[PDB]
Amino acid sequence: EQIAEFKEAFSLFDKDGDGTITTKELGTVMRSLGQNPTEAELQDMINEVDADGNGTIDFPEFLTMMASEEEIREAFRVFDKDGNGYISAAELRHVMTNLGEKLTDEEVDEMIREADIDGDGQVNYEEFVQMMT
Amino acid sequence: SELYTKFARVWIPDPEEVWKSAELLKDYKPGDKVLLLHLEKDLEYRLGELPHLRNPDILVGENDLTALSYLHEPAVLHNLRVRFIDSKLIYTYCGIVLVAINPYEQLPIYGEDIINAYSGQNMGDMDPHIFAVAEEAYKQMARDERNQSIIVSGESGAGKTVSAKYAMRYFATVSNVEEKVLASNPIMESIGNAKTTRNDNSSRFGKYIEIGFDKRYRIIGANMRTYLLEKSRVVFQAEEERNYHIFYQLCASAKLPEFKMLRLGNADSFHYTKQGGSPMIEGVDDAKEMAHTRQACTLLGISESYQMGIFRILAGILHLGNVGFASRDSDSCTIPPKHEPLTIFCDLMGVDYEEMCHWLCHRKLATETYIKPISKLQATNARDALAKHIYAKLFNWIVDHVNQALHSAVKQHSFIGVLDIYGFETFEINSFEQFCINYANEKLQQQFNMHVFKLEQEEYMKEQIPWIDFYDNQPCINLIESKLGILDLLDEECKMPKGTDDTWAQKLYNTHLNKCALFEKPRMSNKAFIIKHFADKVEYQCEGFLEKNKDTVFEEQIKVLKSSKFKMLPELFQKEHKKTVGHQFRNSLHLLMETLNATTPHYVRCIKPNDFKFPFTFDEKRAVQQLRACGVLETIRISAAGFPSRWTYQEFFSRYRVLMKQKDVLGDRKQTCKNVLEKLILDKDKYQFGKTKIFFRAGQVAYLEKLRADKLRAACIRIQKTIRGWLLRKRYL
Ligand SMILES: [Ca+2]
Ligand SMILES: [Ca+2]
Ligand SMILES: [Ca+2]
Ligand SMILES: [Ca+2]
C-alpha cells in the first residue's frame, strides 16, 4: 500500500535499481529539482539515514526514515508562472519543457483540454488538483 | 482485426433503432467467437465476420458522406441523423448527390441574402444546399454551353416539389415563370397524382420542367414535358388505392349547379373509382380541391368553357366504365336498350347513341372486310382501352395548354430542366405499376453510374492517378426490356387469347430461371417472380399483368368520337392503337432518356425521415428504407470499394504531424507525407499519391485517427507521470 508508494519513491532515487541510493544518484535527483548540493552536503545527507554505515541507503533504511494539500498548492504556483490562478497551455508548455519532457503543442493542448473540466480553455486550482489525483 | 481493441466502438443490429452503438470490453483475439460489448447492459455478441466499426468523431457530421472512412450503412444513418437532429441540417452531400431530409418545418434558409451568398461560389466551398446544385447547373450551362438536368427524385411528399420550387426561385433570382409553374401544380396533381396504399398524394408520372434562357442566360419561359403516365390506374385500382384525384374532386362536386349535367354519383358508384374501397382520404377535402383545381386552370388561361369540356370528358370516362355488356353467348355481346351510362356518355361526349353502341359491340375486320361481333370480354377490354386513351390524350391536351401560358416568343438559347420523378417503389404486394417504376429507375440509375464514372476518370487524370470500378446495370435493364425479356414476353403472351398470368409466369421461368442470376422464383409460388434491381430485390405478383398490359383501342370507336359535335373532343386526337401499356411505357421512358442524356445531369435525393409529418424527427427504419430506395446505400457501397477518402497533402500534415518524428520531416512536405505514410501503413495498395491529394481506401483514415488518438492518450499519461516523479522527489527532499 502506502508502503508500495514509498517503494515507487525509493525507485525514483535508485536509478540503477541496484537496491541502494548513492550520493551520485542523490545529487542527480537534487540537481534535477533545481538544487545544487556539494558532494559534502550529499554525504552528510546520505549518512543521516545510513543505519549500517555502509555509505549508501537501502530501502529499509529509507522506509524507516519517512515513517499534501500544501504540496499541490506549491506545485500549482510553479506551473502558474503569472500567478493569475489559471494555468494556460503556454505556462504548461513552459514547465514541461523545463522538466525535461519534449512534447508537441498538440500534445500540450490535449492535456489542457482533458484537465479543463469547466471547458474554459485553461486550468484553475481545483482542476489541477483533480488532474493530479 | 487489430481495430477491435478495448473500448473500441461498433454498431450492432437492433430491432428498433436498426443499428445500436456498442463498446468493446475485452480485445478480440483472432479465434474468439464472442465479443464482450457494452450498451449504454453488457452483451456477448454471436460471431466468421466482425460487426461494423464506428467512425472517429472528427469525421462525424461532415458535409459529404464520402468523407466517412468506414463507409457503411450505419455510418450513413448516424451521420445524417446527427447533422439533422443536433445541427438542424437537412442538406448533406454524398459525392455529387445532394441528400435532402424533410424537416416538416419552414426553414429560413431560402431568402435573398442566402441566394446572394451561394451565387458566384464553387460547389463545395459552401455548405450543402439546394441552391448550390442550382448554382452549379447554372454555372455549367454558361461555361460548357451545355443544357442541364436537375433530377429530383424520391417518394411524393418527401420534398421533391419543395426542392424544385427553390431551384426555380434561385434561377429567377440570379437571372412570371416560377409563379405560373407553381400555379399549375393543383392541375398536374389532380390529373397525375393518386392515393396509393403507402402515399395519399403520389405522382404517377415524371414531370420535366424545361426552364428556358436567352443568349444572356436570363429566363424567358418554361416548357413542361411529361413521361411515364400510369395508364393502368384509369380503369383499375388495388385495395386501398384510388384513381387519379380529379375523378374524386368531380364526384365530390356532384351537386354543384354547374355539374348537374355530369350526372355524377358518388365515387363508390363508379366502376372506375370504387375498386379500392377508399373514396376518401383522411384530411383531404376533394370538394375543396376541385375548387383549387378550377382556380388553377383559370390562372393558367384555360377558359371556363374549356374547363367544362375537361369535366365532360372525365365524367364521360366515368360513365363509360359503368356501361354494362350483355353476353349473347358467347362470341357475342350487346348493350341493353336505352342504357343509362351509355346515354349519358354519348350526351356528354356529343356522339350518337346507336353509332357508339354498335362499335362498342363490333369490330371492323379488314382480302375481305367483315363486321365482326365481339364477346363481352373483348368489348370490356376495348372499352377500357378507350377510357385509357381518352384520359391520356386529355392529360396531354391539358399539359399543352398549360404550356401555352409558359412559352415565350423569345428564341431559346439553352435550358435547365428540373425533373420531378418518383424513385424506387416496393410495396408488400408489387404489380405492373411498380414494375414500370422500377424499370424507369434502372434507366435513370444507369445514366447516374456512367456520369459518376466519367467524373471519377477526369478526377483521377487531373490528379495523375491511373485506373477503378464500374458497376453496370445493363444486365438488369436487358432482362427487363430486350427481346425475350420480361416486357417482350408479356407482350407475346397478350396476343395469345389463351394466354394467362400463369402461362406467362411459366415462360418467364423457362426463359430466365437459372439462366439470369438477377431473376429468381419464390420457392412456394408459381404466380410470382423476383428481380434483383439496383437497390434491392423486388418480388412481383404476376396477377393482373396481362390485363394491365393490354391496350387495344378499336379504330371505329375513335372515329365516332372524332366526329363528335362536342368540339373539344376531336382536339384530343389530332397499331399504334394496338400498342401495349408496357411498350408505350418503354417508348415514353426512352424518350425521357433521350432528353436526359443530351444534358449534364445533377442529382437531388429527397427523403422522408418519419411517417407522421413530425418536425425534425428521425425514424431509423423509415430513413434506411428511404436511403435504400433512393439509391444512396448502393452508390455508397460502390464508393466504399474504391478510394473514397481524399486529402490534400496540406491537410494530411495539419492532422498527422503528431505522428511524425523530426528525423523525417522535410522541406518538401508532400514528400514527408509520402514517406511518413509508407511507414504507418505498410500495404501500399491502401493509398495512392496524386498531384495535390492522397487517395485512401476505406478504413485507412480511421486507422490514422486511432494512431493519433493513441499518441495523444500516451502523451497525457506521460505528462501526468513526469509530474508525479517531480512531486514525489520534492516531497522527500
Ligand atoms: Ca543505485
Ligand atoms: Ca546502508
Ligand atoms: Ca496564468
Ligand atoms: Ca477551466
Bridge-partner residues for B540, per DSSP? B430, B529
Looking at the structure, do residues A9 and A64 belong to the same domain, yes or no?
yes
CA B217 from chain centre, in angstroms, equals 29
B625: number of CA atoms within 13 Å, CB side?
Answer: 15
Looking at the structure, do residues B464 and B528 belong to the same domain, yes or no?
yes
Contact B410, B215 (CB under 8 A): no
Please tell me if residue A69 touches chain B, with a CB cutoff of 8 Å: no
Q: Which of A68, A92, A120 is the last residue of a domain?
A: A68
Is B159 assigned a ligand-binding role in the annotation? yes
User: Closest by alpha carbon to B560, among B303, B285, B310, B358?
Assistant: B358
Looking at the structure, do residues B374 and B338 belong to the same domain, yes or no?
yes
The amino acid sitting at B250 is L
Q: Which residues surround ligand 2, an ion (CB under 5 A)?
A: A 50, 52, 54, 56
Bridge-partner residues for B13, per DSSP? B19
Q: How many domains does chain B have?
A: 3
Total residue count of chain A as it appears in this document: 133
Bridge-partner residues for B181, per DSSP? none
* Contact between chains at B729 and A8 (C-beta distance less than 8 A): no
Residue B623 in domain: no
The amino acid sitting at B719 is I
Q: How many domains does chain A have?
A: 2
Burial of B626-648, coded b for 16+ CB within 10 Å and e otherwise, reads bbbbbbbbbbbebbbebbbbbbe
The residue annotated as part of the active site, out of B163, B196, B203, B449, is: B203
Looking at the structure, do residues B536 and B567 belong to the same domain, yes or no?
no
Q: How far is the centre of ligand 4, averaged over its atoms, from the C-alpha of A102 (Å)?
A: 24
CB-nearest partner of B719 from A13, A33, A111? A111
Looking at the structure, do residues B478 and B508 belong to the same domain, yes or no?
yes
Cell numbers standing for residue B462: 487531373
Domain limits at B567? 327-394+552-574
Looking at the structure, do residues A114 and A99 belong to the same domain, yes or no?
yes
CB-nearest partner of A107 from B658, B720, B722? B658
Looking at the structure, do residues B456 and B538 belong to the same domain, yes or no?
yes
Give dist(CA B661, CA B133) in Å, integer: 43
Give dist(CA B240, CA B221) in Å, integer: 40
Name the percent of chain A in helix, strand, coil, to the closest 5. Answer: 60, 5, 35
Residue B376 CB neighbours (<10 A): 19
Give dist(CA B483, CA B586) in Å, integer: 13
Cell numbers standing for residue B593: 432518356
- Residue B339, exposed/middle/buried by CB under 10 A (0-12, 13-18, 19+)? buried
User: Closest by alpha carbon to B638, among B462, B452, B465, B466?
Assistant: B452
Looking at the structure, do residues A83 and A57 belong to the same domain, yes or no?
no
Helix (H, G, I), strand (E, B) or coil at A31: helix
Residue B202 bears catalytic tag: yes
Q: How far is the centre of ligand 2, averaged over its atoms, from the C-alpha of A27 (Å)?
A: 17
* Contact between chains at B722 and A9 (C-beta distance less than 8 A): no
B535 DSSP assignment: S
Residue B349 in domain: yes
How big is the CA angle at B499 (ends B357 and B361), to the nearest 5 degrees? 5
Peptide bond into B330 cis (omega under 30): yes
Looking at the structure, do residues A61 and A85 belong to the same domain, yes or no?
no
Please identify among residues 102-121 of chain A the ones whose CB lies closer than 8 Å to any CB of chain B.
103-104, 106-107, 110-111, 114
Cβ neighbours for B130, distance < 8 A, ≥ 6 positions apart: B91, B98, B100, B163, B166, B167, B170, B604
Distances (CA, A) of B574 to B267, B345, B393, B397, B563: 31, 21, 10, 10, 12
Give dist(CA B62, CA B701) in Å, integer: 14
Cell numbers standing for residue B680: 504507418
DSSP string, B83-145: HHHTS---EEEETTEEEEE--SS--S-SSHHHHHHHTTPPTTTS---HHHHHHHHHHHHHHHT
B334 DSSP assignment: E
Query: B657: which chain A residues are within 8 Å (Cβ-Cβ)?
Result: 104, 106
The residue annotated as part of the active site, out of B55, B161, B278, B599, is: B161
Looking at the structure, do residues B440 and B535 belong to the same domain, yes or no?
yes
Looking at the structure, do residues A54 and A12 belong to the same domain, yes or no?
yes
Looking at the structure, do residues A84 and A63 belong to the same domain, yes or no?
no
CB-nearest partner of A107 from B712, B727, B730? B712
Give dist(CA B443, CA B431) in Å, integer: 19
Give dist(CA A51, CA A58) in Å, integer: 9
Give dist(CA A46, CA B476) in Å, integer: 89
Cell numbers standing for residue B478: 436487358
CATH code of B6's domain: 2.30.30
Burial of B263-287, coded b for 16+ CB within 10 Å and e otherwise, reads bbeebeebbbbbbbebbeeeebebb
Give dist(CA B50, CA B12) in Å, integer: 10
Looking at the structure, do residues A79 and A124 belong to the same domain, yes or no?
yes
Contact B22, B9 (CB under 8 A): yes
Peptide bond into B576 cis (omega under 30): yes
Ligand lying nearest the CA atom of residue A62: 2
Helix (H, G, I), strand (E, B) or coil at A121: coil
Total residue count of chain B as it appears in this document: 733
Range list of H helices, B405-499:
432-462, 474-481, 486-494
User: Closest by alpha carbon to B391, among B230, B274, B206?
Assistant: B230
Give dist(CA B719, CA A132) in Å, integer: 10
Query: A71: which chain B residues are within 8 Å (Cβ-Cβ)?
Result: 727, 730-731
Cell numbers standing for residue B395: 392529360
How big is the CA angle at B608 (ends B123 and B699), to the nearest 5 degrees? 55
The amino acid sitting at B552 is T
Helix (H, G, I), strand (E, B) or coil at B685: helix
Distances (CA, A) of B445 to B143, B459, B473, B487, B690: 26, 21, 8, 19, 29
Helix (H, G, I), strand (E, B) or coil at B647: strand
Give dist(CA A105, CA A89) in Å, integer: 9
Give dist(CA B66, CA B647) in Å, integer: 12
B482 DSSP assignment: S
CA distance A118 to chain B (A): 19
- Residue B553, exposed/middle/buried by CB under 10 A (0-12, 13-18, 19+)? buried
**Residue entry with cell 425521357:** B592
User: Closest by alpha carbon to B605, among B573, B633, B583?
Assistant: B633
Q: How far is the centre of ligand 1, averaged over its atoms, from the C-alpha of A21 (Å)?
A: 5
How big is the CA angle at B640 (ends B39 and B695), to the nearest 5 degrees? 115
Bridge-partner residues for B209, per DSSP? B224, B418
* Contact between chains at B715 and A103 (C-beta distance less than 8 A): yes
Cell numbers standing for residue B705: 485517427
Residue B10 CB neighbours (<10 A): 22
Query: B728: which chain A residues are within 8 Å (Cβ-Cβ)?
Result: 8-9, 12
Cell numbers standing for residue A47: 549518512
Ligand lying nearest the CA atom of residue A121: 4
φ/ψ bin of B51: left (φ > 0), alpha (ψ from -120 to 50), beta (otherwise): beta
CA distance A4 to chain B (A): 13
Termini Cα distance of chain B: 49
Looking at the structure, do residues B570 and B513 belong to the same domain, yes or no?
no
Is B163 assigned a ligand-binding role in the annotation? no
User: Closest by alpha carbon to B92, among B118, B129, B54?
Assistant: B129
Contact B522, B463 (CB under 8 A): no
Looking at the structure, do residues A112 and A78 belong to the same domain, yes or no?
yes
Contact B504, B493 (CB under 8 A): yes
Q: Of A10, A23, A28, A29, which to mutate for an interface test with B (greatest number of B Cβ within 10 Å)?
A: A29
The amino acid sitting at B426 is T
Query: A132: which chain B residues are within 8 Å (Cβ-Cβ)?
Result: 720, 723-724, 727
* CA dihedral over B476, B482, B484, B486, signed as positive or negative: positive
Taking any CB pair shorter than 8 Å as contact, residues of chain B touching chain A are 657-658, 711-712, 715-716, 718-720, 722-733
Residue B63 CB neighbours (<10 A): 14
H-run or E-run covering A32: helix A23-32
The residue annotated as part of the active site, out of B149, B153, B156, B672, is: B156
Please tell me if residue A63 touches chain B, with a CB cutoff of 8 Å: no
Give the pairing of strands B52-53 and B528-532: unpaired
How big is the CA angle at B203 (ends B202 and B208), to the nearest 5 degrees? 155
For chain A, what is the radius of gyration of the CA atoms? 18
Residue B7 in domain: yes
Contact A85, B702 (CB under 8 A): no
User: Closest by alpha carbon to B407, among B202, B548, B212, B229?
Assistant: B212
CA distance B672 to chain A (A): 18
Bridge-partner residues for B373, per DSSP? B362
Give dist(CA B361, CA B376) in Å, integer: 8
* Contact between chains at A101 and B722 (C-beta distance less than 8 A): yes
Bridge-partner residues for B222, per DSSP? B211
Distances (CA, A) of A7 to A15, A60, B10, B701: 13, 10, 41, 43
Distances (CA, A) of B2 to B5, B75, B704: 6, 20, 13
Contact B581, B551 (CB under 8 A): yes
The amino acid sitting at A125 is Y
Contact B587, B487 (CB under 8 A): no
Return the beta strands (E) in B552-642 as ranges. 600-607
Q: How far is the centre of ligand 3, averaged over its atoms, from the C-alpha of B698 (Å)?
A: 44
Q: How far is the centre of ligand 2, averaged over its atoms, from the C-alpha of B60 (Å)?
A: 61
DSSP string, A98-118: HTT----HHHHHHHHHHH-TT
Looking at the structure, do residues B336 and B385 belong to the same domain, yes or no?
yes
Give dist(CA B494, CA B489) in Å, integer: 9
Residue B567 in domain: yes
Cβ neighbours for A119, distance < 8 A, ≥ 6 positions apart: none
Residue B82 in domain: no
Looking at the structure, do residues B471 and B563 belong to the same domain, yes or no?
no
Q: How far is the centre of ligand 3, averaged over its atoms, from the C-alpha of A79 (Å)?
A: 8
A82 DSSP assignment: T
CATH code of B521's domain: 1.20.58.530
Contacts by B165-168 with C-beta closer than 8 Å and gap 24+? B166/B110, B166/B130, B166/B131, B166/B134, B167/B130, B167/B133, B167/B134, B167/B418, B168/B209, B168/B211, B168/B418
Contact A59, A3 (CB under 8 A): no
Give the pairing of strands B326-327 and B333-334: antiparallel
Query: A23: which chain B residues are within 8 Å (Cβ-Cβ)?
Result: none
Burial of B94-114, coded b for 16+ CB within 10 Å and e otherwise, reads bbbbbbbbbbbeeeebbeeee
Give dist(CA A78, CA A27) in Å, integer: 22
Domain limits at A62? 5-68
* Contact between chains at A13 and B727 (C-beta distance less than 8 A): no
Looking at the structure, do residues A83 and A128 belong to the same domain, yes or no?
yes
Q: Of B705, B729, B731, which to mutate for an interface test with A (greatest number of A Cβ within 10 Å)?
A: B729
CB-nearest partner of A99 from B720, B722, B731? B722
Residue B106 in domain: no
Q: Of B719, B720, B724, B727, which to mutate for an interface test with A (greatest number of A Cβ within 10 Å)?
A: B719
Query: A94: which chain B residues are within 8 Å (Cβ-Cβ)?
Result: none
Contact B101, B624 (CB under 8 A): no
Looking at the structure, do residues A56 and A78 belong to the same domain, yes or no?
no
Give, to the nearest 10 degrees, the angle between helix B486-494 and helix B581-597: 150
User: Closest by alpha carbon to B314, among B255, B241, B390, B400?
Assistant: B390
DSSP string, B189-256: HHHHEE--SS-SSEE-SEEEEEEEE-TT--EEEEEEEEE---GGGGT---TT--SBHHHHHHHTTTTS
CA distance B74 to chain A (A): 29
Distances (CA, A) of B123 to B118, B120, B150, B475, B644: 9, 10, 15, 34, 18
Residue B282 in domain: no
Please tell me if residue A59 touches chain B, with a CB cutoff of 8 Å: no
Torsion of CA B163, B167, B172, B178, to 10 degrees: -40
CATH code of B567's domain: 1.20.120.720
Looking at the structure, do residues B443 and B477 belong to the same domain, yes or no?
yes
Give dist(CA B452, CA B654) in Å, integer: 30
Torsion of CA B516, B520, B521, B523, to 10 degrees: 120
Give, to the nearest 10 degrees, the angle between helix B376-404 and helix B353-361: 120
Q: Which of A68, A89, A113 is the last residue of a domain?
A: A68
* Contact between chains at A132 and B733 (C-beta distance less than 8 A): no
The residue annotated as part of the active site, out of B199, B431, B588, B635, is: B199
Residue B667 bears catalytic tag: no
Ligand lying nearest the CA atom of residue A21: 1
Residue B203 bears catalytic tag: yes
Contact B694, B651 (CB under 8 A): no
Contact B332, B375 (CB under 8 A): yes
Residue B15 CB neighbours (<10 A): 7
Bridge-partner residues for A1, per DSSP? none
Is A126 assigned a ligand-binding role in the annotation? no
Give dist(CA B210, CA B419) in Å, integer: 9
Residue B153 in domain: no
Looking at the structure, do residues A46 and A63 belong to the same domain, yes or no?
yes
Looking at the structure, do residues A111 and A62 belong to the same domain, yes or no?
no
User: Closest by alpha carbon to B51, among B3, B17, B109?
Assistant: B3
Looking at the structure, do residues B568 and B526 belong to the same domain, yes or no?
no
Query: B57: which chain A residues are within 8 Å (Cβ-Cβ)?
Result: none
CB-nearest partner of A33 from B720, B722, B733? B733
Resolution of the experimental structure, in angstroms: 2.5
φ/ψ bin of B120: left (φ > 0), alpha (ψ from -120 to 50), beta (otherwise): left
Looking at the structure, do residues B449 and B538 belong to the same domain, yes or no?
yes
The amino acid sitting at B520 is E
- Residue B494, exposed/middle/buried by CB under 10 A (0-12, 13-18, 19+)? buried
Distances (CA, A) of B580 to B62, B378, B549: 48, 15, 6
Give dist(CA B123, CA B184) in Å, integer: 32
CA distance B712 to chain A (A): 6
Burial of B67-89, coded b for 16+ CB within 10 Å and e otherwise, reads bbbbbbbbbbbbbbbebbeeeeb
Is B631 assigned a ligand-binding role in the annotation? no
Give dist(CA B344, CA B62) in Å, integer: 63
